[PDB]
Ligand binder design. Structure first.
Ligand SMILES: [Ca+2]
Ligand SMILES: [Ca+2]
Ligand SMILES: [Ca+2]
Ligand SMILES: [Ca+2]
Ligand SMILES: [Mg+2]
Ligand SMILES: [Mg+2]
Ligand SMILES: [Mg+2]
Ligand SMILES: [Mg+2]
Ligand SMILES: [Mg+2]
Ligand SMILES: [Mg+2]
Ligand SMILES: [Mg+2]
Ligand SMILES: [Mg+2]
Ligand SMILES: [Mg+2]
Ligand SMILES: [Mg+2]
Ligand SMILES: [Mg+2]
Ligand SMILES: [Mg+2]
Ligand SMILES: [Mg+2]
Ligand SMILES: [Mg+2]
Ligand SMILES: [Mg+2]
Ligand SMILES: [Mg+2]
Ligand SMILES: [Mg+2]
Ligand SMILES: [Mg+2]
Ligand SMILES: [Mg+2]
Ligand SMILES: [Mg+2]
Ligand SMILES: [Mg+2]
Ligand SMILES: [Mg+2]
Ligand SMILES: [Mg+2]
Ligand SMILES: [Mg+2]
Ligand SMILES: [Mg+2]
Ligand SMILES: [Mg+2]
Ligand SMILES: [Mg+2]
Ligand SMILES: [Mg+2]
Ligand SMILES: [Mg+2]
Ligand SMILES: [Mg+2]
Ligand SMILES: [Mg+2]
Ligand SMILES: [Mg+2]
Ligand SMILES: [Mg+2]
Ligand SMILES: [Mg+2]
Ligand SMILES: [Mg+2]
Ligand SMILES: [Mg+2]
Ligand SMILES: [Mg+2]
Ligand SMILES: [Mg+2]
Ligand SMILES: [Mg+2]
Ligand SMILES: [Mg+2]
Ligand SMILES: [Mg+2]
Ligand SMILES: [Mg+2]
Ligand SMILES: [Mg+2]
Ligand SMILES: [Mg+2]
Ligand SMILES: [Mg+2]
Ligand SMILES: [Mg+2]
Ligand SMILES: [Mg+2]
Ligand SMILES: [Mg+2]
Ligand SMILES: [Mg+2]
Ligand SMILES: [Mg+2]
Ligand SMILES: [Mg+2]
Ligand SMILES: [Mg+2]
Ligand SMILES: [Mg+2]
Ligand SMILES: [Mg+2]
Ligand SMILES: [Mg+2]
Ligand SMILES: [Mg+2]
Ligand SMILES: [Mg+2]
Ligand SMILES: [Mg+2]
Ligand SMILES: [Mg+2]
Ligand SMILES: [Mg+2]
Ligand SMILES: [Mg+2]
Ligand SMILES: [Mg+2]
Ligand SMILES: [Mg+2]
Ligand SMILES: [Mg+2]
Ligand SMILES: [Mg+2]
Ligand SMILES: [Mg+2]
Ligand SMILES: [Mg+2]
Ligand SMILES: [Mg+2]
Ligand SMILES: [Mg+2]
Ligand SMILES: [Mg+2]
Ligand SMILES: [Mg+2]
Ligand SMILES: [Mg+2]
Ligand SMILES: [Mg+2]
Ligand SMILES: [Mg+2]
Ligand SMILES: [Mg+2]
Ligand SMILES: [Mg+2]
Ligand SMILES: [Mg+2]
Ligand SMILES: [Mg+2]
Ligand SMILES: [Mg+2]
Ligand SMILES: [Mg+2]
Ligand SMILES: [Mg+2]
Ligand SMILES: [Mg+2]
Ligand SMILES: [Mg+2]
Ligand SMILES: [Mg+2]
Ligand SMILES: [Mg+2]
Ligand SMILES: [Mg+2]
Ligand SMILES: [Mg+2]
Ligand SMILES: [Mg+2]
Ligand SMILES: [Mg+2]
Ligand SMILES: [Mg+2]
Ligand SMILES: [Mg+2]
Ligand SMILES: [Mg+2]
Ligand SMILES: [Mg+2]
Ligand SMILES: [Mg+2]
Ligand SMILES: [Mg+2]
Ligand SMILES: [Mg+2]
Ligand SMILES: [Mg+2]
Ligand SMILES: [Mg+2]
Ligand SMILES: [Mg+2]
Ligand SMILES: [Mg+2]
Ligand SMILES: [Mg+2]
Ligand SMILES: [Mg+2]
Ligand SMILES: [Mg+2]
Ligand SMILES: [Mg+2]
Ligand SMILES: [Mg+2]
Ligand SMILES: [Mg+2]
Ligand SMILES: [Mg+2]
Ligand SMILES: [Mg+2]
Ligand SMILES: [Mg+2]
Ligand SMILES: [Mg+2]
Ligand SMILES: [Mg+2]
Ligand SMILES: [Mg+2]
Ligand SMILES: [Mg+2]
Ligand SMILES: [Mg+2]
Ligand SMILES: [Mg+2]
Ligand SMILES: [Mg+2]
Ligand SMILES: [Mg+2]
Ligand SMILES: [Mg+2]
Ligand SMILES: [Mg+2]
Ligand SMILES: [Mg+2]
Ligand SMILES: [Mg+2]
Ligand SMILES: [Mg+2]
Ligand SMILES: [Mg+2]
Ligand SMILES: [Mg+2]
Ligand SMILES: [Mg+2]
Ligand SMILES: [Mg+2]
Ligand SMILES: [Mg+2]
Ligand SMILES: [Mg+2]
Ligand SMILES: [Mg+2]
Ligand SMILES: [Mg+2]
Ligand SMILES: [Mg+2]
Ligand SMILES: [Mg+2]
Ligand SMILES: [Mg+2]
Ligand SMILES: [Mg+2]
Ligand SMILES: [Mg+2]
Ligand SMILES: [Mg+2]
Ligand SMILES: [Mg+2]
Ligand SMILES: [Mg+2]
Ligand SMILES: [Mg+2]
Ligand SMILES: [Mg+2]
Ligand SMILES: [Mg+2]
Ligand SMILES: [Mg+2]
Ligand SMILES: [Mg+2]
Ligand SMILES: [Mg+2]
Ligand SMILES: [Mg+2]
Ligand SMILES: [Mg+2]
Ligand SMILES: [Mg+2]
Ligand SMILES: [Mg+2]
Ligand SMILES: [Mg+2]
Ligand SMILES: [Mg+2]
Ligand SMILES: [Mg+2]
Ligand SMILES: [Mg+2]
Ligand SMILES: [Mg+2]
Ligand SMILES: [Mg+2]
Ligand SMILES: [Mg+2]
Ligand SMILES: [Mg+2]
Ligand SMILES: [Mg+2]
Ligand SMILES: [Mg+2]
Ligand SMILES: [Mg+2]
Ligand SMILES: [Mg+2]
Ligand SMILES: [Mg+2]
Ligand SMILES: [Mg+2]
Ligand SMILES: [Mg+2]
Ligand SMILES: [Mg+2]
Ligand SMILES: [Mg+2]
Ligand SMILES: [Mg+2]
Length: 74
RNA sequence: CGAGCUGGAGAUACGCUUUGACUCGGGGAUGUCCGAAUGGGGAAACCCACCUCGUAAGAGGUAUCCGCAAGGAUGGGAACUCAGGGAACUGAAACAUCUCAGUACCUGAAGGAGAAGAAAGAGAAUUCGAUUCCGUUAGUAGCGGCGAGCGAACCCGGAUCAGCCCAAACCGAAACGCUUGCGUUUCGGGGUUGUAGGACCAUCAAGCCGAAGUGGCUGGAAAGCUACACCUCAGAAGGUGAGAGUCCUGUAGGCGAACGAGCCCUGAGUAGGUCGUUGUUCGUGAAACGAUGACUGAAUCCGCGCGGACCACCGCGCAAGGCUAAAUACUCCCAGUGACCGAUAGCGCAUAGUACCGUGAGGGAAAGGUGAAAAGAACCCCGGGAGGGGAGUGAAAGAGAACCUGAAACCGUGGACUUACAAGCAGUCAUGGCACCUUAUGCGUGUUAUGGCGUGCCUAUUGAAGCAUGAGCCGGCGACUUAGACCUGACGUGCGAGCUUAAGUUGAAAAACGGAGGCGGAGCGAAAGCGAGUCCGAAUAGGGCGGCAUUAGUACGUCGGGCUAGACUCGAAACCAGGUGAGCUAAGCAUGACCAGGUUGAAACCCCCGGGGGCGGAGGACCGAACCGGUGCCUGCUGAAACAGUCUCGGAUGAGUUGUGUUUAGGAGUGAAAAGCU
RNA sequence: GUAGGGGAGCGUUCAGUCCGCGGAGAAGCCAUACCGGAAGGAGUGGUGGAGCCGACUGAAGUGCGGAUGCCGGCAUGAGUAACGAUAAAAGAAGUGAGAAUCUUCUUCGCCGUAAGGACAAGGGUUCCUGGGGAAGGGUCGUCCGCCCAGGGAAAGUCGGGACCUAAGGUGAGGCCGAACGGCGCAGCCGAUGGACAGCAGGUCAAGAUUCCUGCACCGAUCAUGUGGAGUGAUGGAGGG
RNA sequence: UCUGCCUCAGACGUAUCGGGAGCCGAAGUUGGAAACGCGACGGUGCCAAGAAAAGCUUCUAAACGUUGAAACAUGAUUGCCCGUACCGCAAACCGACACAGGUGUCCGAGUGUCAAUGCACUAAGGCGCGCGAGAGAACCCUCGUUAAGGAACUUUGCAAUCUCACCCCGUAACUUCGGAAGAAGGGGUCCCCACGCUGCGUGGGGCGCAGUGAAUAGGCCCAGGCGACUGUUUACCAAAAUCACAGCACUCUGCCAACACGAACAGUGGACGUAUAGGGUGUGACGCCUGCCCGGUGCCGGAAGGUCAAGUGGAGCGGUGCAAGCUGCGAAAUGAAGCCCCGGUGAACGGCGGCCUAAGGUAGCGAAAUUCCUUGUCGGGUAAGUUCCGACCUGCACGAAAGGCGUAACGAUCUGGGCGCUGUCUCAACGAGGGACUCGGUGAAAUUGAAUUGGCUGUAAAGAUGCGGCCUACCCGUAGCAGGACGAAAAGACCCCGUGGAGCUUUACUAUAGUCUGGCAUUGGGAUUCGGGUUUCUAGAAACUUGGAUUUCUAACCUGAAAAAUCACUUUCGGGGACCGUGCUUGGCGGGUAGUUUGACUGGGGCGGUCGCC
RNA sequence: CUUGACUGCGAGACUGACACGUCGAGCAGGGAGGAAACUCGGGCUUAGUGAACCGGUGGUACCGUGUGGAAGGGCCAUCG
């Protein structure tokens, strides 16, 4: 379960294939080409302390842990 | 409760019961084995253990995850709720954006509901005041290949309404932390916000009681007819030999149990930002705001967020902490009701997820009737029986268990009139013959001979007897509907310059109330706006519009059309989702088994000088059975068989054949490769 | 007079109200020469045996010849084709209501690396005995693998388990992943393989390394005696 | 450090328990044969190199004892759970059936015949296949013989003859020296006796039309095409020239390999393999060989110049405020990969031409599995030859690893000829058995608007039993035939149509898995040169950097070895290393995948033409 | 000589299913040629052409979501 930093997980968004830089700056408006989905996550870490452990953490979670222990020391 | 009971079960034997059975209401106690299954294993319901009890027979324990511990969780639910995922046919008369639709489906969590909920809101009145649901706003504002199409909210009227506690500024700790009366997280007091607050300093149950009719008549049988009565807080209903207010059960009404269920501070890796995206009417549009995936990253009450780029002013509100009943949804289950069905209907089932089909997932029938009462036919006759004929019973056996009615197609027996030189969509009209006489002695009815005339029905078509479609026949089932405060007409009713309600409230053997809101009443314009005038325009020319013809409107109802939705019924090839299949077949893997018999004669090694002899016994070698296979012909072609048989033929120690066990699958597997097998 | 528009109506079920009818007989069914302009409606008779007509109003699952329409029944082809290997059958005797077909006897013909025998999968009482004769049997049937009832099935040593491991399947911890889930060491499951103690006979109608008779073998516990001391693992080696 | 010990397969004897033909119990001999079974785990050869675990034997660790041991002898006691009947190559399993199909293993006797599980007949055993009886017509099926002829049949000698087993003699081109080969051909085959040898051989005699006396048991040869070869394929119309194949070649791949399955920094396969290996592609034994063209496309290098995204940069232009400030855009310069551009590359996609393009066919073959005209022309074979063989070449439209020419052997391959022999034929006959016919029993099916259903000729929607005229025809059946009923079966697979479908293709459109690439994060100190920042100070440089860039470092992170196989821990420890991998984002590539598009008229559609206006 | 290759309009008719298309007297503002009457809103006439959508450029000050602006939109003219 890719849930990070005992906190948060992956999300999903459609990604849209914009056919033009035209409209809104002087042309027939932008057309459309893509209706397809994607994911998005983040990556591994180490050294949990409820007593001792090592688990997934996120980028900004490693930041928050660097600026002080936060519910679970590090 | 007050005499029966011994399940359906209908079949006897056996008993039990007025010291109260049986049945009903309410508790206990037993509770094999499987199944979350949980001592370990497992192909569910079967195998194998261990530990204390220990006299044995028997009992108790032995899964995992939460927690010191109590105590909790795991699994199961028709639909309903929320969440994580998330289609495609389809419409756009093609198709990409778009729609279908966050629909189906899958998955997770929970309950009797759920979700949501107590304003950094709505919004433009310095109005409002948690959430949800209904009406209306309104198909308005908007969105949109500005196409198809999609589509809010506020105000207002209703259903129900409840608001509540923590964090933190400060006390008092304790423990630990360091240069010496301090600050990281626990525990109490205290303290909980925007008209800013707070700190520190002055009834339902099982049940019981319950009124009133007798004589004659028809009849197999009284409840019907009749004649006289009676009760009625009770004429709702069902049973009873046919239709019962007064025969039974009941009904109105009354009572009713031990245990039984039930209302100095005010939240930071955040707010905010850039990149990707997305939600609400929000399709990158001038696109705000919320939402996170990545990287960054503030401020305190002279402060922070919003008011649809953005700025100033003016307003509304205090984010980053939690809980929260009721109005809402649904229907496995129970009760009542029905301009609902009544045996091809109604649920698939008058019961069956059965029979039956499938390896499976899964699919899936037909279903009825003696009689009031079994009195269910003793006895006799033909027959092995089956079947029948009598006798009995019964009102009826014109009800006899192939048991209400019993149509039609189809099969027969008997009778009338007819037919063995005739050419024929089968009739029709005319006349003679022969029968017959119950709407019936006639302008009859049945049937005939002979004349004239005469190309089935439907559909589809320029055109059907067509050698063009459909159909064996008869029975039954079978196709222009429904919905919505939607549009537009005809007819009819009410009220009329005015007409009317919606949601709901209260009453229901009945309907009233409810003005929120909707339609007329003013038009012209892109619009601001003017206004019987208005727009174009520098004034005179026009468009539309009122006057005059003021056609009078509105709410209902029936009807003709329209729109939207399966939209007159039946019919695809296909597309997508989640599952079931490698017990056939294509392959792999592990472990086993199999190949009569015969022919040939390789290397090596030993002799004579690469040759000859000795010997040896090699091979995707040869002939050939088993076995594996399918070459050619015939047969078979409603088969012996949904791929075979006889004859013939190929391989037959190898790239061989075969058995167990197991692995691989749907855009996928497998394939000595045909798009073949799955 | 076709598509099409318009008008007036007939019949079916259900509902409300009326008028009534019915065991001296209702609906339904059956015959029919009467009536109405049509859809239709009445009269009378036969059948039936318990409900029902007429009028007015209302609401519809409301009118069938078709759809290679559905369900069901019944026909035509027709006493037709077939009766499932060209391995033949004949006589006598018996049983019986009944016999080409069942039982017996004596011959004949057919298989004989089978068309004989013993097992495994699979089937599930098909086995034996006594009865039966509807249907099943491609005819018959006294018979049957059909129907009814009663019996039959015996293991320390055979095959499996209480022993082992292969592919494969699982799998605490562990590694991954929107969810459900996907991998995975040890260990565990898993026979198609490894290990392991009996042979000869007899015999129920129906069982046989199982029961019986004869005579063995294997493990375990105990006892008597000899011995009167070292046993010697979830680990090592050989070996299988 | 010096053959011998053990074992009994099995035989023999003695005894004993059984069995034994038979009317309770007799005999149990001599000679021969012989397993895939047993002795056994024997011997020999070979390459492709042939499970694991427990039981079992042996050692200590711990513990328990060392005057109630291990072990042995006898006696006793003990012995759980499940399967076991019957069918079991089929009437009981799978095939809807009491179905001519299918189903793994074991045993499967005798006589004859080189051998044998073959063939014939038979033992034990098991069966005569659950309608029968007659008749001896047509036709149909499976068979026997056939005069004279002998392929004249036909698409084709398809079918069916012929041949057939063992022994002897004898065998060609050609060859990869094995083979072709059972080449072809010719002879023998029984019975008796005598003689020699180990059932043979030598001789003599005998009978028959005939002696593998019946059954099983090759017809052969000449010449081509294709493929070398054994083998593999379309379960159910194709077995082949298809597929594969040994051999060859190009290219990729340094090891957490390339590549492939995968939600995945997981795990696997490659492979417990490591360049003499693995993947991909194409050719296809062997022999002689594999030519010209790099312009286009692909690929490998180059990387002076042009173009190019996010990002950095933000000069300048505007709103709105009294102002402070807030705010919408927004350049130049610098930013990757890629593409343009330049070289090379063919056993890379390809190309080797019409009376300029990059070049224009080297060998070899050629009227062909390719050749239109075409039956080309000559020759061969035939009486006669569109076929076939050989030359020729005018190759519509061969050609060198989509390989070119050859090749012995192989082939249920295809094509032409010959010998032999035949009912394939002239041209059919006679015979047999199973149906067809008849009788008794049981008794279907497709089809069917209804039928009282004729001929000619004419008309009708244009092929008439049914309409018109004329002819013919007494009623009803049974056995037969196959013209008609536009006979039956499947609402035509051809064709056209539908703004239907689906499979596949590419330089059609559009996305996208995948993959490459710049920026940011994980992500860290240091030295070094630093375009520059700030306060430092007699144009100037020390505290320092915001960074970029080689370089280097070891705490991140990855990865490896050590009693602890995956993982976790220390590691005397080892290597990589701020790269990689991963997360977001930028641009490229991306038929690997995916959703779709691909007009109409049209004397059927397509091709050609044509779509508006005068 | 000069622009009538004009702005505001359009009584009436031809023509077409629409939607487009054609001809136009006369009115105003302002011009032009003529001495005048008068004729000029393109060419002897009939071909030299594209709805809508979305956008570019110039004006106008209508809309602009609390108000005052501005972003954005509308109207007029034109381009693709
Ligand atoms: Ca007959
Ligand atoms: Ca017939
Ligand atoms: Ca002859
Ligand atoms: Ca018959
Ligand atoms: Mg979503
Ligand atoms: Mg009672
Ligand atoms: Mg009873
Ligand atoms: Mg269990
Ligand atoms: Mg359990
Ligand atoms: Mg338990
Ligand atoms: Mg589609
Ligand atoms: Mg569409
Ligand atoms: Mg789409
Ligand atoms: Mg649903
Ligand atoms: Mg669910
Ligand atoms: Mg649940
Ligand atoms: Mg309200
Ligand atoms: Mg009653
Ligand atoms: Mg009375
Ligand atoms: Mg707060
Ligand atoms: Mg944000
Ligand atoms: Mg954004
Ligand atoms: Mg758009
Ligand atoms: Mg704002
Ligand atoms: Mg926001
Ligand atoms: Mg605002
Ligand atoms: Mg009814
Ligand atoms: Mg039913
Ligand atoms: Mg019925
Ligand atoms: Mg059903
Ligand atoms: Mg089944
Ligand atoms: Mg089943
Ligand atoms: Mg009854
Ligand atoms: Mg009977
Ligand atoms: Mg009787
Ligand atoms: Mg009587
Ligand atoms: Mg009767
Ligand atoms: Mg009756
Ligand atoms: Mg009867
Ligand atoms: Mg009755
Ligand atoms: Mg009846
Ligand atoms: Mg008769
Ligand atoms: Mg008659
Ligand atoms: Mg005659
Ligand atoms: Mg006559
Ligand atoms: Mg006739
Ligand atoms: Mg007549
Ligand atoms: Mg026609
Ligand atoms: Mg006609
Ligand atoms: Mg006809
Ligand atoms: Mg017809
Ligand atoms: Mg047709
Ligand atoms: Mg037909
Ligand atoms: Mg309305
Ligand atoms: Mg509504
Ligand atoms: Mg007017
Ligand atoms: Mg109306
Ligand atoms: Mg219309
Ligand atoms: Mg629709
Ligand atoms: Mg799918
Ligand atoms: Mg299998
Ligand atoms: Mg064997
Ligand atoms: Mg052999
Ligand atoms: Mg020798
Ligand atoms: Mg061979
Ligand atoms: Mg050979
Ligand atoms: Mg076979
Ligand atoms: Mg095959
Ligand atoms: Mg051969
Ligand atoms: Mg061979
Ligand atoms: Mg694919
Ligand atoms: Mg009556
Ligand atoms: Mg009538
Ligand atoms: Mg009655
Ligand atoms: Mg209907
Ligand atoms: Mg009709
Ligand atoms: Mg019909
Ligand atoms: Mg039918
Ligand atoms: Mg047959
Ligand atoms: Mg007999
Ligand atoms: Mg007798
Ligand atoms: Mg009989
Ligand atoms: Mg017989
Ligand atoms: Mg018999
Ligand atoms: Mg006898
Ligand atoms: Mg057998
Ligand atoms: Mg069994
Ligand atoms: Mg059994
Ligand atoms: Mg039996
Ligand atoms: Mg018997
Ligand atoms: Mg019996
Ligand atoms: Mg019988
Ligand atoms: Mg019976
Ligand atoms: Mg029978
Ligand atoms: Mg024993
Ligand atoms: Mg065993
Ligand atoms: Mg095990
Ligand atoms: Mg494993
Ligand atoms: Mg697993
Ligand atoms: Mg086994
Ligand atoms: Mg044993
Ligand atoms: Mg016996
Ligand atoms: Mg037996
Ligand atoms: Mg025995
Ligand atoms: Mg002896
Ligand atoms: Mg083990
Ligand atoms: Mg047995
Ligand atoms: Mg069979
Ligand atoms: Mg077999
Ligand atoms: Mg043998
Ligand atoms: Mg033999
Ligand atoms: Mg022999
Ligand atoms: Mg044989
Ligand atoms: Mg048998
Ligand atoms: Mg004959
Ligand atoms: Mg034959
Ligand atoms: Mg002769
Ligand atoms: Mg000859
Ligand atoms: Mg000829
Ligand atoms: Mg010839
Ligand atoms: Mg041929
Ligand atoms: Mg032949
Ligand atoms: Mg030579
Ligand atoms: Mg030679
Ligand atoms: Mg040859
Ligand atoms: Mg002679
Ligand atoms: Mg001779
Ligand atoms: Mg012979
Ligand atoms: Mg040729
Ligand atoms: Mg070949
Ligand atoms: Mg085939
Ligand atoms: Mg197959
Ligand atoms: Mg074939
Ligand atoms: Mg890894
Ligand atoms: Mg690996
Ligand atoms: Mg090839
Ligand atoms: Mg070359
Ligand atoms: Mg020639
Ligand atoms: Mg030719
Ligand atoms: Mg010649
Ligand atoms: Mg010639
Ligand atoms: Mg010929
Ligand atoms: Mg030919
Ligand atoms: Mg030639
Ligand atoms: Mg070629
Ligand atoms: Mg080549
Ligand atoms: Mg070739
Ligand atoms: Mg060649
Ligand atoms: Mg072959
Ligand atoms: Mg030939
Ligand atoms: Mg010839
Ligand atoms: Mg019979
Ligand atoms: Mg039939
Ligand atoms: Mg004519
Ligand atoms: Mg004619
Ligand atoms: Mg005629
Ligand atoms: Mg006629
Ligand atoms: Mg025939
Ligand atoms: Mg068709
Ligand atoms: Mg399509
Ligand atoms: Mg990508
Ligand atoms: Mg991108
Ligand atoms: Mg495609
Ligand atoms: Mg593309
Ligand atoms: Mg066309
Ligand atoms: Mg002048
Ligand atoms: Mg004018
Ligand atoms: Mg503008
Ligand atoms: Mg404003
Ligand atoms: Mg503007």
């Amino acid at each position: 379960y890719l849930t990070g930093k005992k906190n948060l997980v992956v999300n999903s968004v459609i990604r849209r294939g914009k056919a033009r830089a035209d409209g809104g700056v002087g042309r027939k408006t932008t057309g459309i080409t893509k209706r397809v989905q994607r994911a998005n996550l983040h990556k591994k870490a180490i050294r949990e302390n409820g007593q001792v452990k090592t688990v997934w953490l996120s980028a900004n979670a490693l930041r928050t842990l660097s600026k002080g222990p936060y519910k679970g020391i590090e």
